[PDB]
Symmetry: C3
Subunit: 444 residues, 3 copies
């Protein structure tokens, strides 16, 4: 028989996210290769190269092989273990109870030794159950690393495109501000301007100019992150990352049934498999409450004279049945069993915490995405109005019917609005990534 | 003998925090349930719910159970370990020393086997001292998690109230800016305005409007964090978290004597107990320099014929006193003892680092709190002057004695000042949390074991 | 024999950082005491005190000692292990084979017990090779912690200087803003001003005043970080941290050949030593495919009567040669060997990851530093233009027919620019730190 608890997966309720019933989302299908929806072949090539090259993923694959090797070793314990031996014991001395003379003694043995734990209460079965669950946990850990890797990479690519977009914006605004700085100098030098206007124009041109190397530094840091995520050195990136627009998804997002997310996410499965392994380990400990039945054997040759080894006259066999039971040391056995029970309770609570964290992450991703869409509508309006204002202010300054501060402020506001809108477009992109990461998108 | 060093807790000096003698603080009392002084029943409910629901606290209690179980196994080594066995050896072959004929041979044994390490140099006593200290470490780890959980929860609630407060401010400013934008449109349509005024007002309104969903998103993140902290799913949070004012404490903070903080913090006790355990482990290794004295026994039956087991003619007993000593392998013993001494040294330095980190955290919390109060005084003044300016600019713009940019700039400044003051009020709240977390308040004493 | 793979350090290509063939850098030598280039004696004394007092460094040295002790234990397995014993076995019962009567039995033994694994396939030598490499990894971990600690400390000191500089700038700007507010109130009181000017000036003053305690709190946080990094309590710091200018390095930075950084970095060596150890462990597992040859021994006394112990009549010796082989359990041995190989594949992939992270760190540090220099050029210009604008705006506001907003906006821009420039100066200093951290600076080879 097999003693100890018989594991049953927790009866975990499906995820419920009411917001997913609204129009930004499509619950009728889930895209597993979710990043392909951006229709960006550069991004797709990055992801393919990362899955082949990423070194953390290679570590995880190796850990899975290591777990399977451990399970394979334990699985042999279900059967007799038959090893081989040639040994002797040779000496001279008294033989207490036989003689007080110092006598020569010799014994020689050559043969097969067998050790067999008969698995009557399932200690070994439970060890294998545990090892098998831990191999499945390691597979789930690998899948989770793929989910996390793909999301990190797709996210970094967005950050790269964002920095490139923000640089383009900064440079376009810098050109507008260089044009008005030129105009302040021309009006000043024709006697219808002011040194104060030029100085203010110079200060704001320099502020804008200072943003450009900061954005370039951010783009470079993103490129270097991408290289490492691909398993590549910074100078050896294969994929051309010259500027392109930030990608977008204009269809409703195919998110499937949010109720499936806890079954899809590999981190949840890994934690469930760790729980299953810990539950089996309670059974391993439980079996020690019961007797241990074992059977040793020897087959081969035994002799007092080494010259006879291998002959018919020295053939020998032996069997060694044994039953052991903790008896008065059952207290120690019970202590170990309490320890296994505690470990299993820790694994259950840890599994439950992983569920809660997954539900938090998904709730956050959906809440953030809806709000990022809303925020973008306002920022687009802000940018449109700010451009029109700056255009009108420039006409009026040139024509002498407004003061330079009106134009300066309008230019400041145009840049601020256009850069905020860009950052919000990046946030939307990153929000898509956060949704698919939370849903357990992307693994093999 | 119980060999090896006798552990003595480090003579660590009391924390000294000079700033605590000032008017913001009350050293005459300490409040263990420190969050109650916010007089916020919703907060109190959240904390109490968290203590029964939080899953990380369940892990930590399980880890404590596990440490006790390890101790209980060690504790039994102080006595004879008496197990039971029924065994045989059955075979056919030569019997070296007895005969060279291949003969049948049988031996049967049935009885109690006893194994006993006489603990003459206290090796087992030191092992139990270590296990007992590690159980205490695990109790302190749970208490430190309670401290950390409560501070994190109270802080998250502040962040929620802050996002709600900032939303209210954004919407109040948005209303003012809608009125201004309407006025620009009216003046334009009267032929006494300008399209430039309207466009600038439209841009400002949209900027303020864009802030609202960002603040709403922050509030939802805070709500979801609170749910997990309570051990609840996001959609099953019961507690009504509809907006309320950010809580405040207007009496001097009851912080007790800062000299008690190192003794109160469970993280410092956890590290001290690990030090104690490591020092006991030096004693375990020191015992192996000395001989190990043991006594085995058998009581039951032994026979050559399985048929005689259980008969008086098969009764048997034996005792096996034994002394062993490492002798020429003392070099290995000494290597293990160097290893144990190095581990104890690591535990001591770790302990001292935890002390320093605790003193850093408390120093930071007190310095931050006094500066946050000072900061808020100036921001309150900024907000007041900024509202007066925006009101007067709006009057002047409507009458035609100031240009729109003067109004626009004043509206910008009003929002900037009000929002800054709200962030500073949240920082003050968070600063109170940081003070209490650093003082090690709020944990439940353990019943322990007997 | 010593079986299993014979470890060879990976043939990892040298780092290539093209941008270091530029003007801000001196590739002709590397300054190992890299922080001394700031010519800041207070900083220098912080570093020395940290090396003396930092408790994390103490933990790491203790871990190194523990790894060496482990190794020393393993090394004794190469020889016979000879222990000592005094024992007796006394009882009453049958003696299967010998007799069916219940007879009294007494036996006494006193001597040396020897156990010896003959290391014919190198199992034990592979164990020692592993343990030796893990002790070298512990040493590299300690050296990496020192690199990291020194960088963290130097960085924290720059942050402290930054907060003190920004506080100075805030207070200077506050003074200018108080003067402007006085003028608003005078102009109002002389009937050529406006209450609206005064209110806006008061709001501005309050805003700048609010920044001061925030910057002071940042400076105190940095002080307290510094104390811990020194191994000191916050109120006991032994180094005077009263305000001083942020340090600067005007000569080209001595960075050596960037191609050497992977050999200098202790984290890379620690990962390489863990890969060497895991490679040895494959050998340990490999050795179990082969027979294990052992020899036990006893030398001493054996008697039936206790009084004979130690006498020539009770002299006794024995030897126990043995050879064992897994035979039908070779499948278990093979499983363990697959596991060891997997563990060594993980170590190799971990080592390569550590190389990529180092190359990323160094690429980021050099890219950032060049761009931080460029950015500071623009910000210096911004500050200069902003100060001149604010002075001219104050002249114009006094000339008495311009709205205060022109002055207010110029004063906001002056403070914004000066503060931004200071932050950028801090970022340049922190960028130097990041460069040297990324190159493996801060530990000294013996
Ligand atoms: C992790 C929670 C552990 C609770 C253990 C309950 C499950 C079964 O455990 C065991 O199976 C044996 C069957 O003969 C019984 O004899 C044991 O005494 C019983 O407790
Ligand atoms: C006293 C008898 C004990 C059981 C004897 C061993 C029974 C079979 O044992 C099996 O032998 C096979 C080869 O023959 C091996 O390959 C297997 O690993 C082993 O389990
Ligand atoms: C050969 C005798 C085998 C008897 C079965 C072992 C004794 C079982 O003892 C059981 O152990 C558990 C310990 O946690 C307890 O929960 C049960 O109450 C107790 O009955
Ligand atoms: C076949 C063996 C006969 C001996 C039966 C031993 C059963 C005793 O059992 C154990 O002994 C101790 C009581 O002092 C405690 O550790 C346990 O509570 C008890 O279950
Ligand atoms: C024939 C039985 C085994 C031979 C044992 C070889 C004994 C040499 O062995 C050595 O003895 C030294 C004492 O001089 C000790 O210091 C060493 O630790 C031990 O390795
Ligand atoms: C088999 C019985 C022989 C027992 C001899 C015991 C000698 C114990 O001697 C002990 O050895 C330690 C190791 O060097 C020293 O540190 C102690 O000072 C010493 O008392
Ligand atoms: C029974 C004890 C076996 C001892 C093995 C002999 C010692 C071999 O030692 C070996 O020497 C070689 C040549 O110098 C080196 O290349 C090996 O790395 C080293 O381990
Ligand atoms: C005294 C020598 C005994 C002979 C032992 C023969 C061992 C056979 O070794 C075999 O290797 C196979 C590899 O394909 C595996 O299937 C098995 O684990 C094993 O039976
Ligand atoms: C597995 C345990 C408990 O289950 C059974 O009784 C099944 C019996 C199948 C042989 O029992 C054993 O295997 C031990 C035998 C108990 C007899 C007293
Ligand atoms: C690994 C090899 C190396 O040993 C030799 O080549 C001979 C020296 C050993 C005495 O060891 C073996 O595989 C030994 C083969 C022995 C065959 C009976
Ligand atoms: C419980 O399942 C025990 C397994 C029975 C196998 C046969 C024992 C002779
Ligand atoms: C590797 O072949 C090991 C050989 C060592 C020779 C010594 C034998 C006693
Ligand atoms: Na096995
Ligand atoms: Na025990
Ligand atoms: Na040893």
């Amino acid at each position: 028989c097999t003693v100890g608890p018989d594991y049953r997966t927790p009866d975990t309720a499906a995820a419920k996210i009411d917001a997913t019933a609204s129009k930004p989302y499509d619950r009728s299908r889930f895209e597993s290769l979710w990043w392909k929806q951006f229709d960006d072949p550069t991004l797709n090539q990055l992801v393919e190269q990362s899955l082949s090259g990423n070194r953390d993923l290679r570590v995880a694959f190796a850990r899975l092989r290591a777990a399977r090797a451990l399970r394979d070793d334990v699985a042999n314990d279900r059967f007799p273990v038959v090893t081989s031996r040639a040994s002797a014991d040779i000496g001279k001395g008294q033989q207490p109870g036989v003689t007080e003379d110092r006598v020569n003694s010799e014994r020689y043995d050559l043969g097969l030794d067998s050790a067999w734990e008969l698995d009557l209460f399932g200690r070994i079965r439970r060890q294998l159950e545990s090892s098998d669950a831990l191999s499945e946990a390691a597979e789930a850990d690998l899948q989770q690393l793929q989910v996390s890797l793909i999301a990190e990479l797709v996210d970094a690519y967005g950050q790269l495109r964002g920095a490139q977009l923000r640089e383009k914006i900064a440079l376009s605004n810098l050109e507008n501000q260089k044009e008005s700085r030129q105009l302040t100098e021309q009006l000043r030098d024709a006697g219808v301007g002011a040194e104060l206007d030029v100085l203010r124009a110079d200060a704001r041109l320099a502020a804008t100019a200072a943003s450009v190397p900061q954005l370039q530094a951010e783009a470079e840091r993103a490129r270097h992150r991408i290289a490492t995520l691909l398993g590549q050195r910074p100078e050896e990136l294969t994929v051309d990352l010259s500027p392109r627009d930030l990608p977008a998804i204009t269809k409703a997002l195919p998110i499937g049934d949010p109720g499936e997310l806890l079954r899809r996410r590999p981190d949840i499965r890994a934690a469930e498999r760790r729980l299953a392994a810990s539950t089996a380990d309670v059974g391993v400990a439980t079996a020690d409450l019961f007797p241990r039945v074992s059977l040793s054997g020897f087959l081969g040759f035994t002799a007092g004279r080494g010259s006879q080894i291998g002959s018919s006259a020295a053939r020998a066999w032996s069997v060694g049945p044994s039953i052991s039971w903790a008896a008065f040391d059952l207290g120690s056995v019970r202590a170990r069993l309490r320890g296994a029970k505690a470990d299993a309770d820790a694994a259950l609570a840890s599994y439950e915490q992983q569920v809660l964290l997954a539900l938090e992450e998904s709730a956050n991703a959906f809440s953030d995405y809806g709000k990022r869409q809303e925020r973008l509508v306002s920022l687009v309006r802000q940018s449109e109005a700010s451009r029109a204002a700056a255009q009108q202010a420039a006409i009026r300054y040139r024509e002498g019917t407004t003061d330079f501060l009106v134009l300066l402020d309008a230019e400041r506001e145009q840049l601020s609005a256009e850069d905020a809108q860009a950052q919000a477009e990046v946030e939307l992109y990153r929000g898509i990534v956060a949704i698919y990461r939370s849903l357990g998108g992307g693994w093999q």
